[PDB]
């Protein structure tokens, strides 16, 4: 049980890292649509 | 190339008419004239085994054209497999163009790559075959190489009987079955596309 | 414009909504737009049966039905108004297509129509700073990728728009260049290349021929026989003793002593000036016209064949097409890379307007006579302006302080050149390349950051497997 | 590329011009027929079959004149055909054709599409039906006979 609890604290840190990664991915997704609109404006 | 008991050439004209004559005049009908009936196709009949129910189709040269492939496909259809002839050069350009060419459309699942003209270049040939092995598993039943015969006393270590042996070993029935399955599935896909368009309307 | 569509789709006109619901605005180019507009109800069956037209419409994502054709025409015209993609060049394309379709109605409608706000360079700057912001955001979230993004931004910032300018000598180019810069510069027997660049120092770096370039010139003197006479006159003042490798004079205050026959030994004068025109990261290449052909012409066509992102060719208002000028223009028309170079009729004064347009008509007829096929329509590649440099140069400081700047052509020519910094194909190509770079760096960042989530998921799966193994061991 | 745009326009012009705008090899019947056929096919929504029929009619002018031998129940037309051939050939039927060559051979065109060139001797066999062999669509006797 103790090893599981230590892994749970490490997985709180890892959960925060995963959420940050998801946020970065969402930002990149937004950027790509913005880029497509910028391309659309050209002609 | 089709089988017979003698050497014939059948010249099928665009106007519909044909003429059967000796293979010797083949050149004349290949070379076009201004007035002579422009030929639709040429049909070499020969008393050669392996033309027994495995007939051969000469295709256009790939003169650096990306859409040459689909144009050829539109021209002529129902090809169960092919022999891709290439010289020693096996650059990435050839890999990409082979991929767009075959696309399962024209070479699907069993077709040979043939490197030609070993005689013009060994350790080098060994390296090239290794390159082809890792690069060109696109084609099936190994990419092969050679050619010299016909008043070479040897007639051989031209791997020519390897190519011939493959062409013999082809399971023609399976080829036909798989091809028909593929085409029927394509037609089904087309019909479903149309139906869904109507549904969407 | 329902009356127009009634005119061109007399009975087959459909119930349709007159607005450009265009979703791309770049779906098709101007020639394709002109073709779609030329599908008048009298050509429509033939067009729909034409394989090439079907290919075109599949490229544009059209049907070949009547309704979609008319809707596309509506959208094309509303883009012609609102997003304002077309110019009189769209009318050019329709006049070209008049070989097939005598579509006078849409032609006149496009001609006589309040066009719109134009807005080009402001939109260019807006889009470019959008892309800069996207680059910064990508840099924020890896070190290799950030360095790549920084180098891309450095490349796209303040980058090398080159105007080559040419013409026969008596037509005159230094006078026009002075008036474009709105002050004097070098010059008001011949030749040397002149490169007006923008730089911190106000150098005037000079290059003379090499030993081998002069050997080439002396070899050609045997054959030219006027260059030979001039070379005999020149070698009397023997500055030859202009030798083996390196003659790089770094500075001068535009000495005109070289006009006393030394310029024949000069090939290349590389000025680094401060002028607002060049302050905008523009660079001009003035080119010789007529003599010391041997290697000065070779280096002229080197400079023009090199980067040059636009070509202006000058002809004086009263030059009879100047057979060398005609051959050069023909070479220009056959070069598919040129893509609509420009012609300026210099010294627009001294000649009645609407007689200047007759001069342009004669020019284009000559160029068509030199290209006998549908090749004739290649002359529609050329634009023509009519500028007088004297009046604009006068307005800045000289006699005609009354406004001759306009009514000369220089203001419009300057507007044209500045428009070529977004309307020119080069600027849009650069923006497209920047967008592709940002997309690919974005893809790299996606790979980098998705791999972290994948590794975390794999670690969670391994922890679950370890827990299952522990449970199995307890059961055992 | 504006040069490429002009070239695109010129290509379209050439294609439309070549398809809809050409006068044929007139001053002789042969292609006045083609002009009439073109008249019959710009917009008149004419059927695929009508178009193909007109095409075949146009072709007819360049091709073998077809003359048919109409026999009775059996009026000895087989012997007449043998006499015409010189060599002799043959329960009935396939569409059978007499054509010229430099040797006596038969081409058997099958219904499945396939064909084969073989000896004239085999003609009878391919006329007479079998249970499990490719049934012939037509038979083509080639012979070194003038008037073929």
Coordinates of N, CA and C in Angstrom, one line a residue, chain B residues 2-5 8 10 12 14-21 37 45 53, chain D residues 56 59 62-64 99-101 105 107 109 113-117 134 142:
Chain B
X2 N 0.6 -12.8 -77.0 CA -0.3 -14.0 -76.9 C 0.3 -15.2 -77.6
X3 N -0.3 -16.4 -77.2 CA 0.2 -17.6 -77.7 C -0.5 -18.1 -79.0
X4 N 0.2 -18.8 -79.8 CA -0.3 -19.4 -81.0 C 0.6 -20.6 -81.3
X5 N 0.4 -21.2 -82.5 CA 1.3 -22.2 -83.0 C 2.3 -21.6 -84.0
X8 N 2.6 -14.7 -85.5 CA 1.7 -13.7 -86.2 C 1.8 -12.4 -85.5
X10 N -1.2 -9.3 -85.2 CA -2.5 -8.8 -85.5 C -2.5 -7.3 -85.3
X12 N -4.7 -4.3 -84.9 CA -6.1 -3.8 -84.7 C -6.0 -2.3 -85.0
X14 N -7.8 1.7 -85.4 CA -8.7 2.5 -84.7 C -10.1 2.5 -85.4
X15 N -10.1 2.4 -86.7 CA -11.4 2.4 -87.4 C -12.2 1.1 -87.1
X16 N -11.6 0.1 -86.4 CA -12.3 -1.1 -86.0 C -11.7 -2.3 -86.8
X17 N -11.4 -2.1 -88.1 CA -10.8 -3.2 -88.9 C -9.5 -3.7 -88.3
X18 N -9.1 -4.9 -88.6 CA -7.9 -5.5 -88.3 C -7.2 -6.1 -89.5
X19 N -6.0 -6.5 -89.3 CA -5.3 -7.3 -90.3 C -4.3 -8.3 -89.6
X20 N -4.3 -9.5 -90.1 CA -3.3 -10.5 -89.6 C -2.2 -10.7 -90.6
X21 N -1.0 -10.6 -90.1 CA 0.2 -10.7 -91.0 C 1.4 -11.2 -90.2
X37 N -3.8 3.7 -92.1 CA -4.7 3.5 -91.0 C -3.9 3.6 -89.7
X45 N 1.4 -12.7 -81.8 CA 1.1 -14.1 -81.5 C 2.3 -14.9 -81.8
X53 N -2.2 -18.4 -71.5 CA -3.0 -17.9 -70.4 C -2.2 -17.0 -69.4
Chain D
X56 N -19.5 4.6 -86.2 CA -19.4 3.4 -87.0 C -19.7 3.7 -88.5
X59 N -16.8 5.3 -89.9 CA -15.7 4.3 -90.1 C -15.9 3.4 -91.3
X62 N -13.9 3.6 -94.6 CA -12.5 3.2 -94.7 C -12.3 1.7 -94.6
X63 N -13.4 0.9 -94.7 CA -13.4 -0.5 -94.2 C -13.9 -1.4 -95.3
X64 N -13.7 -2.7 -95.1 CA -14.2 -3.8 -95.8 C -15.7 -3.6 -96.2
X99 N -12.4 -13.2 -95.1 CA -11.4 -12.2 -95.1 C -10.2 -12.6 -95.8
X100 N -9.4 -11.7 -96.3 CA -8.2 -12.0 -97.0 C -6.9 -12.1 -96.1
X101 N -6.0 -12.9 -96.6 CA -4.7 -13.1 -95.9 C -3.7 -13.6 -96.9
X105 N -6.1 -19.5 -92.6 CA -6.3 -19.7 -91.1 C -7.6 -19.3 -90.7
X107 N -9.7 -17.4 -87.4 CA -9.7 -16.7 -86.1 C -11.1 -17.0 -85.4
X109 N -13.3 -15.9 -82.5 CA -13.6 -14.9 -81.5 C -14.6 -15.5 -80.6
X113 N -14.8 -12.9 -74.8 CA -13.9 -11.8 -75.2 C -12.7 -12.3 -75.9
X114 N -12.1 -13.4 -75.3 CA -10.9 -14.0 -75.9 C -11.0 -14.4 -77.3
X115 N -9.9 -14.4 -78.0 CA -9.9 -15.0 -79.4 C -8.7 -16.0 -79.5
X116 N -8.6 -16.6 -80.6 CA -7.5 -17.5 -81.0 C -7.4 -17.6 -82.5
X117 N -6.1 -17.6 -82.9 CA -5.8 -17.8 -84.3 C -5.3 -19.2 -84.5
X134 N -15.2 -22.8 -74.2 CA -15.6 -21.5 -74.6 C -16.4 -21.5 -75.9
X142 N -9.8 -16.7 -92.8 CA -8.8 -15.9 -93.6 C -8.3 -16.8 -94.7

